[PDB]
Design a protein around this ligand. Structure first.
Ligand SMILES: Nc1ncnc2c1ncn2[C@@H]1O[C@H](COP(=O)(O)OP(=O)(O)O)[C@@H](O)[C@H]1O
Ligand SMILES: Nc1ncnc2c1ncn2[C@@H]1O[C@H](COP(=O)(O)OP(=O)(O)O)[C@@H](O)[C@H]1O
Ligand SMILES: Nc1ncnc2c1ncn2[C@@H]1O[C@H](COP(=O)(O)OP(=O)(O)O)[C@@H](O)[C@H]1O
Ligand SMILES: Nc1ncnc2c1ncn2[C@@H]1O[C@H](COP(=O)(O)OP(=O)(O)O)[C@@H](O)[C@H]1O
Ligand SMILES: [K+]
Ligand SMILES: [K+]
Ligand SMILES: [Mg+2]
Ligand SMILES: [Mg+2]
Lengths: 132, 438, 436, 133, 132, 132, 132, 132, 132, 133
């Protein structure tokens, strides 16, 4: 019902658009204001915030939301740190977007619920769609 | 704590809209309230109530009617609340917008590469009450024995609020004329609008970092801590020199009374409104000096002012940099960037344009000497409220013009500051061409 | 031809050239005016130096009557002095602009018409315009005054009007010609063209065939603002003075409009007054003060802050109020340094005017409107008096002299100090200062 | 079924994993020798080559394969040029990976049979999976 | 007869000169402000804008102009994307300068009406000039 | 009608193509062997040689040819030197391609008969095609 | 007695320093104003000028100077053009500082009296110094 | 009679040419294969190597040679490193080419016996030739 | 106890922080203005200046200060130039951070009084801590 | 005194050299064989291996070692991953060097006992030498 997306890049914006189409309350959070404005009309609430900062995450009650997406791809360190703050903040389900396999090993092994590497996953399915 | 904000939506400054509607959102309900005969002994006209409501919300202190008599006890309390809303309301509102402006700056810096708002508001309210409390007890030390327990506190608490808020409203027929040689009230009021017209940022910075010393204070705090005593000193000395031999207003005083009157007028010239001495019989060279003092005003995040002391300070040292042909404007070993220099210069030129049209209009609606027209226009625009006799004989068209001058002067410099901060971005830019200046 | 220069060696240096030129032309004139050959009765050192300052700064303010107190030799001396003031200021500004453009072009080349012919064109334009004014004025004054008196006054007043000096050979300047249109438009055209600027005249001369669209931005600004300023001044002066018995109430409908237009045109740093300013109402006095401040064009014979500076300030204020990123005029962006130059010129002029007004109210005892009007007239080089010049004291004369000197060279000097300042190797950290 | 993969990035290596584990024979092309060596361990044929040159593409005989995959991600010019060369060669079906929508519509104009944009497609499917349907 | 020239290199200035001298009004657009200043002398209107942004082209109102020249030579991506955006903006006639035959076929397939290859066309015409 | 072309870039290949199509015997010189092989099928005679090497030019006997094309674009210095050697050898008419106005001015002042600037000339002529 | 040097780099500044210390009037000309400032104290007359421009070279009477030095190293075309314009203007002796062997060959073909190769002449010199 | 030249630029090629024409045996060391090949046409020994690494310096035994010439011009750091390691190895006499005065004085502090600045030395020598 | 720290990187700021906390006044110099802003809060005086220019160091009056620290890590050449110019300026005690052993020995030869290699020293002393 | 050093960089060699001279048994691990040979004469035992591979670490038996030093600076992600593996293997004390404060803040939340920022630590520690010279 209530969803939170951190990082409003290509992957984050795409998630928000479908989540709003299904009539669900989605929270979009991003460090860059310019990207928040792009997703402002596609989400219920749009906030410019730094999810690396522990106190900022505390105020935005992410534990109330059912699912949380960390969709930061450029900074390998920021995604790892944002995931670790979300888990200690009390988020039950944390989904993390990983760009490389080395990061995916860390995120899974520190306790992230779901690990998503967009380039690999279509790599599997595009092959499957060619096969059949 | 949580440093975040919700963007307004689809990129021009909305803070000027916030300031404009906040001022109009309180003036209109206050205007209709003053029409009720519960607050006035005989009732006020729509124009008179609007002028009074504007003066109370702007805390200019200009009165088409006598405050002490025309208003009832309920009206006097109503005036008391409005000048809280005008002075402390702007001081809180400017601090809130300044806090949110920094938050947007901080997050954008993090993207490329402090207490909470509720906590800050509590200190602003706490500072206002404790300051007015100190003024209340000192003023009660004299007025309670003279007028009684209940009248003494009310007059003391009224004038403590008025002085701190830079309102200048007085419950006596003559504003502080009966206390020319009285140091207790003259200094208690002086301290109230000196610190009231100092800025929460200056008080807050000194409160939190006084132990590190003066060198490690903020640039804005250092400017206000030097220019305000400098302005008080030059105002006191220069008023004393030009008024010591004028029999009408200050020539019949004692030597200590000479300096007390000179200091009180200079302190109240910077947007307070109280006048220990008469301004009608006040010589022209001293009129110009007071006119300059009214324009220079109080601090940026204070209860009142025109263009602020920091705005005058930057332009003053920008001129010094220009004449010495230095590349950068530097104060306290800090460079003032060109956009800030442009803001300081733009506020002066825009204010002067507004003042000229306002001055031109008044000489059309009402007929008086130009020295009186300029003085009244500056007082309304700079929110000082010091009169030269033209206010009493104001006409109906003149009242409307002076209302607009009070409103524009109250919010103008702070609003024009934020328009320069966040202009609307454009994707189409035209070629640059050189225009001869000089 | 050859685009080159020799570097100064080793801050802005053209302000030094302007200042030394002005001083080295003022001092010999002041020395000469003490000689009794030029004055019928002789002048005091203070009065002679005041007259020299008024002639060189082409302000036209007179502590003594021009027609009577000066002899024929002195009258010819005044012509030469006001030529030097106006035309030399125009030529010096043009030469400095040419050298600035040369340095700009050479630095642009490094990163990625000659002066003599330019000076010849400036002199040719001045002589042609002055000859046209001379013949137009001689068409009237020669029949009524004689063959040699008629030519002399016509030539003198053509020289004064083109150079925006305002010196008149009659006891009352242009008071006797309120309703005469010939002399009125003959003088008006001279300081409108003289105050238009040599840059505008040259740009229209060399590029009129391409049309108004392809003219330079400064030329378009002047060609739009000057007629607009003339029209608004004429309309305001007609509206505010058409019921005042002392100045325009007794005149005819055409005469009132003629007087209003003449005062509007001469308020822009010319100095001629068809009507009396002593009996001139307060709002119209404020309007005329504003007009004097706005002044004439940049590379012209006029004074005060120039029309282009006021136009840039106006459009910058409009841009700020609309919260636009760039100041745009005629589909061209005005860069931030130019806006800063305009605003700084206004602020510095205002500060100097405030100090001068305070000093005059100290040394002299008069109403604020008279003191402010006289200070604006002296600083803006206009020379229009409101009755305070005749009652000046000696310290008042000194202060007015300083105001005339600073006003004549100031805005151009402050423009060139901003043009290329001292470079620095040490910079301090930037800190934010709250404004407004 | 024989498949050709152009580009040996993260996407291309995943495609090679799945296709080889599915029992098919694939040919892998890349310009960097480091990536082709890793791919050579499991692919049927691994050749280092540039697919933006007409003669080199002709030598590889791309027309034989029914499905050709282009996985050039960073260089949009290389992706568009390789797609154009493959289409001009006469390969029946072209699948190209795109990073943004402008590249997607340029590939649409060129005539790529199927265009895969991994970021937005994973956004869509992750949103669907969160919606539990 | 209004023209719009996008790209103010050596080719763009020559096109603008020959177009303006023929009595037709032209619009010059470039990202380099120096070249816009150069063209501003003889062009009816010169604009500093990026034509690879779809919103910038929309407010430029290139659809009003009868014919639009895209003269971006160095940046192949800029030429391709400007051509695509111009066609998607509903402009009738698009002329594009191409630096290579591979670029030429791509531009043709996008939908550019006429494609100009300077080196090839000048070579052909110089060879013809040698004959006579 | 006997002609020679020096340098086999895009402009040189276009000149050789059109001039062979016109039906005239040509000799093409280029320092890179692959482009010589590419143009050998079209041109009458193609020899791999350097025209900044004076004795090679003397062996080539360029003075027999009525017109010569020097179409070296990358190295301006090589173009100027080739023009000087061609002029010294006794070529009646020399045509040289220039990429920049400074190179064109140098080439004119040293004595080149015709200066070809592909971008500008295409600029004027494409604009003229735009008019009609 | 009268010397003119164009280009105030490392080579030209050293030429100025030696020539003036020798006791002769030298003219230092450079397009960049900062270099002219640096060399202004040493030389008798320092001028910021562009010797690429014919009219400037005509105005600066280089034809009466005994010898003229062209010491531009970065731009080969600028140096060649400056030498050729100086020869056209009537300078009897022109010495040119050349950075490349191709540039030296072109300048020798033009007619420059003396060609100076900085590191090459040091090549032979230092070799001879090592030998003996 | 045995010389070693580090760096095979134009200065290095010239010094090798003169040393060979005087009958000496030279070793040419450089990092670029093309330039060491060009030197190999005439040098007694040509080795492609980096002289900033100690092990290669010890392997090719600079200490045997009486004079070592370091002609690294573009990279100041490479020249400093080569001089430092040459002095560390124990070669009696080191000659190094410097581009500017700061590099020259750093080299003098390091211990280079003779320092060559070609630009300034040409400046002085051509000035002397100009005088007489 | 006046100190000057040149370079306000990770190492430089900590030195400035500790020195200022210990009751001494320090001077902070850096070319990156945004990095000068951070130090300006706690440092007595901070300056945006380039210390590889001799005149800038002369205006800084580094000779007055008792000790000068150069903490330029990434730019080895800048560290060398700053150390050299500081020695010529007349600083009594100069301390320089070194990132390489060759850099350390070069700095020692120039005249640096104390040389700090943070990685090596920290490794030694952390090994000492782990031992005890 | 049993010690292990992970990553033979500039910091790694300094730790290995000083610690061995005391007389303690040290294990040197590094992915690059060349730097292992340089440390061969300064450590008792040196093995060329990757410590981000879970199976390899079990063979090394890092649990017996009293202290482990992770000195991987170039790859911040490898430093984070290597810290997790040592903790999972049961190593009582883990010391990791951090180049940046952002990496250090992650490392603290991981559970690394000591976080070493060599550039900042020398900042105070060298500066203290300035006060008492
Ligand atoms: N012209 C080309 N021909 C063949 N392969 C190429 C060409 N250009 C790039 N590649 C390869 O395609 C791969 C794509 O890598 P990249 O652009 O980083 O996307 P990803 O690695 O995410 O798939 C690169 O490893 C590169 O070696
Ligand atoms: N995205 C863009 N939008 C608009 N103009 C552009 C864009 N990219 C490049 N240009 C302009 O196109 C011009 C073509 O560059 P260039 O190759 O130098 O021209 P030429 O082919 O004449 O050499 C450049 O001057 C550049 O300013
Ligand atoms: N570390 C190094 N070891 C050996 N030779 C080098 C090294 N670095 C540069 N060189 C050589 O020094 C030569 C000088 O280069 P460059 O400055 O371009 O020529 P020049 O010094 O003649 O101007 C180059 O040819 C280069 O190959
Ligand atoms: N020539 C110079 N003069 C003054 N300061 C410099 C100079 N060169 C570099 N610096 C400063 O020294 C600082 C060192 O930072 P860096 O090289 O990243 O090392 P660290 O890892 O200690 O930050 C940089 O912030 C840079 O601004
Ligand atoms: K007030
Ligand atoms: K005048
Ligand atoms: Mg150079
Ligand atoms: Mg070389």
């Amino acid at each position: 019902k209530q969803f939170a997306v951190i990082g409003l890049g290509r992957f984050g914006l795409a998630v928000c658009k479908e989540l709003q189409d299904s009539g669900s309350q989605v929270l979009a959070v991003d460090i860059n204001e310019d990207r928040v404005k792009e997703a402002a009309g596609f989400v219920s609430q749009a906030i410019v915030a730094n999810c690396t900062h522990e106190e900022t995450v505390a105020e935005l009650k992410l534990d109330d939301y059912d699912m949380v997406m960390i969709a930061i791809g450029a900074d390998v360190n920021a995604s790892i740190l944002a995931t670790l703050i979300a888990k200690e903040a009390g988020v039950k389900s944390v989904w993390v977007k990983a760009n490389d396999r080395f990061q995916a090993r860390v995120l899974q092994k520190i306790g992230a619920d779901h690990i998503i590497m967009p380039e690999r996953d279509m790599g599997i399915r595009v092959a499957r769609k060619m096969l059949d | 704590r949580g440093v975040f904000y919700v963007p307004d939506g689809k990129a021009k400054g909305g803070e000027p809209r916030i300031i404009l509607l906040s001022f109009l959102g309180v003036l209109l309900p206050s205007a209709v309230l003053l029409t009720l005969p519960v607050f006035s002994v005989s009732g006020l006209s729509i124009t008179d109530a609007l002028f009074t409501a504007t003066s109370a919300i702007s805390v200019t202190g200009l009165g088409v009617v006598d405050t002490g008599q025309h208003f009832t006890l309920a009206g006097k309390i109503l005036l008391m609340c409005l000048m809280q809303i005008g002075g402390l309301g702007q001081m809180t509102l400017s601090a809130v917008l300044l806090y949110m402006f920094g938050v947007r700056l901080s997050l954008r810096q993090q993207a490329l590469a402090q207490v909470n708002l509720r906590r800050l508001v509590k200190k602003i309210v706490t500072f206002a009450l404790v300051a007015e409390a100190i003024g209340f007890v000192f003023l009660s030390y004299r007025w309670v024995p003279e007028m009684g327990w209940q009248t003494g506190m009310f007059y003391a608490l009224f004038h403590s609020i008025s002085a701190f808020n830079n309102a200048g409203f007085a419950l006596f027929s003559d504003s502080m004329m009966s206390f020319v040689n009285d140091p207790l009230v003259s200094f208690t009021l002086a301290g109230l609008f000196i610190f009231g017209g100092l800025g929460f940022t200056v008080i807050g910075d000194v409160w939190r970092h006084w132990r590190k010393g003066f060198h490690f204070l903020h640039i804005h705090t250092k400017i206000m801590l030097i220019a305000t005593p400098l302005l008080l000193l030059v105002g006191t000395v220069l008023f004393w020199l030009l008024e010591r031999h004028n029999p009408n207003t200050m020539g019949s005083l004692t030597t200590g009374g000479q300096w007390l009157a000179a200091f009180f007028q200079s302190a109240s010239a910077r947007t307070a409104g109280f006048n220990s001495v008469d301004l009608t019989q006040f010589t022209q060279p001293a009129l110009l000096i007071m006119i300059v003092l009214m324009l220079i005003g109080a601090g940026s995040t204070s209860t009142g002012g025109g263009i602020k002391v920091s705005t005058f300070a930057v332009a003053f040292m920008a001129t010094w940099t220009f004449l010495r042909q230095k590349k950068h404007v530097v104060m306290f070993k800090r460079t003032v960037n060109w956009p800030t220099v442009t803001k300081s210069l733009a506020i002066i030129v825009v204010s002067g344009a507004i003042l000229t049209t306002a001055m031109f209009l008044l000489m059309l609606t009402e007929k008086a000497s130009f020295d009186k027209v300029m003085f009244e226009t500056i007082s309304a625009f700079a929110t000082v409220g010091l009169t030269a006799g033209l206010t009493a004989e104001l006409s109906e068209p003149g009242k409307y013009i002076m209302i607009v001058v009070m409103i524009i002067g109250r919010i103008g410099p702070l609003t024009l500051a934020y328009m320069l901060a966040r202009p609307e971005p454009t994707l189409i830019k035209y070629p640059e061409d050189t225009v001869l200046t000089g």
